[PDB]
Amino acid sequence: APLADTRFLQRRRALSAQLAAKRIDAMLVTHLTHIRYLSGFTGSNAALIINKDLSARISTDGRYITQIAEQVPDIESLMARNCAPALLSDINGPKRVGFEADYLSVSQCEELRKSAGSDVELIPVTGAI
Ligand SMILES: [Cl-]
């Protein structure tokens, strides 16, 4: 009988379950308090991708590599100055990727779109995840 799931694993699982209904394959979380709620990472720069199959990947800059391994030992990390574009550019299509349209700015979103692959579509999702 195993060690119980962390609350962060449980929150991710609940978001993963919300994805079918929002008609997306993955969610890109860029609002920091949302990333903290879903992962435990308390730093000031991150991006976080949660997939339908329950896997996840988290990104942060070089100042936080040690801390993210310590605070988030259950998600593989990617170092990047520009976190969200770097996670997105690593996705191989086809994939519908939701984003927090209530929180990303028009120009932050235009920057993301540049990094998306030829069959990765970004989908505006409203609400606090
Ligand atoms: Cl817990």
TrEMBL record:
Domain of life of the native organism: Bacteria
Creatinase N-terminal domain residues: 11-129
Name by which UniProt lists this protein: Metallopeptidase
Species in which this protein is naturally found: Corynebacterium diphtheriae (strain ATCC 700971 / NCTC 13129 / Biotype gravis)
Lineage: Bacteria, Bacillati, Actinomycetota, Actinomycetes, Mycobacteriales
